Amino acid sequence: PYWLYKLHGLNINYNCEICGNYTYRGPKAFQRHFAEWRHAHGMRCLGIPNTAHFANVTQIEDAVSLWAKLKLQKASERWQPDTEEEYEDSSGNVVNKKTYEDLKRQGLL
C-alpha cells in the first residue's frame, strides 16, 4: 500500500534531542511521542516535569529556558506569606511596621 506510506504521513521524519536524537516518523506518531514513556524519561533527565506546556518542544536549551520562564511566572503569582506580610512588632508597639514574618519571631523570641 505504498500509497498509504505517503498518504498517512510516512517518509517524513522528525527528531528530538530530548529523546536521544530518536528520529520519529509521520506527524501523527511524532505528536503523540511527547506523552509516551521515552519522552517522559528524557525530560526527567533535566528535572523538568512533562506537562502540556512542554509539547512540540524538541531541543534541550529551549526546554530549560521555558522552564525558567514558567518557574518565574508561577512563583511570582503565588501568595508567599513569609516575605509578603506586614507585621508591626510590640517592641515600640507604635512604630516599625516594616517587620517581615521572620523578624517578628526574632523580636518576640
Partner: protein
C-alpha cells in the same frame, strides 16, 4: 521569517495552548491570544483528519434506543398524564463548552444484597454484631485515612446501628432560597 514553536512559546502568556500549526498562521499572536480567552470552546478537532467525521470503528453496533424511565413508568387518561408529568425528570446535559467527537461515548455503609450474600445478619436492638473487618480495627486501632469515621462498639454506641448502616462519618447560615413558589 516565521516563528518557531519554542520561540512563540516564549512570547505568549499561556504557552500550553500553542500547537504545531499555530506558527503557520497569518497572525499567530492574535490566534494564541484568542485561544486563551476565558471562554470560547475550541475547534472540532477533526478538521485535519481524513475520515469524514465518522469513525468506522469502536464497535458502534449497539442497542437502537433506550427510552427514559418516564416512558414506561383509551391508552392513558389524565391520570396517566398526571403520572407522566410527575415522573418527568431532567436528563443529563453537557455545559456550554463540551463538544462531541467520534470517540467520547465509550470512554461505613454497605448494600443489602452484599450483606445478604456475605452471610452477615441484620442489626439487633441492643447487642454487639460487628462486621468481620471491624475486629481488625478494634485490635490494631482506627484507620489513619479516615479518622472521622465512627463504628459501633469502638466509637459509636450500640443502641449507632439501624438497618444496613454500620458506620457514620462525623466531620468536625440562612440557607433557604429567596424567591420560590409555595
Amino acid at each position: 521569517n516565521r516563528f518557531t514553536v519554542a520561540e512563540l512559546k516564549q512570547l505568549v502568556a499561556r504557552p500550553d495552548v500553542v500547537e504545531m500549526h499555530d506558527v503557520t498562521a497569518q497572525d499567530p499572536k492574535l490566534l494564541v491570544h484568542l485561544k486563551a480567552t476565558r471562554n470560547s470552546v475550541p475547534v472540532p478537532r477533526h478538521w485535519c483528519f481524513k475520515r469524514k467525521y465518522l469513525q468506522g470503528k469502536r464497535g458502534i453496533e449497539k442497542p437502537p434506543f433506550e427510552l427514559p424511565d418516564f416512558i414506561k413508568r383509551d391508552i392513558d387518561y389524565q391520570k396517566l398524564h398526571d403520572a407522566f408529568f410527575k415522573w418527568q425528570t431532567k436528563p443529563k446535559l453537557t455545559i456550554h463548552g463540551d463538544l462531541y467527537y467520534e470517540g467520547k461515548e465509550f470512554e461505613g455503609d454497605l448494600s443489602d444484597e452484599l450483606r445478604i450474600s456475605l452471610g452477615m445478619p441484620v442489626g439487633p436492638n441492643a447487642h454487639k454484631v460487628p462486621p468481620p473487618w471491624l475486629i481488625a480495627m478494634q485490635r490494631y486501632g482506627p484507620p489513619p485515612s479516615y479518622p472521622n469515621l465512627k463504628i459501633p462498639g469502638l466509637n459509636s454506641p450500640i443502641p449507632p446501628l439501624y438497618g444496613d448502616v454500620f458506620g457514620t462519618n462525623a466531620a468536625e447560615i440562612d440557607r433557604t432560597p429567596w424567591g420560590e413558589l409555595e
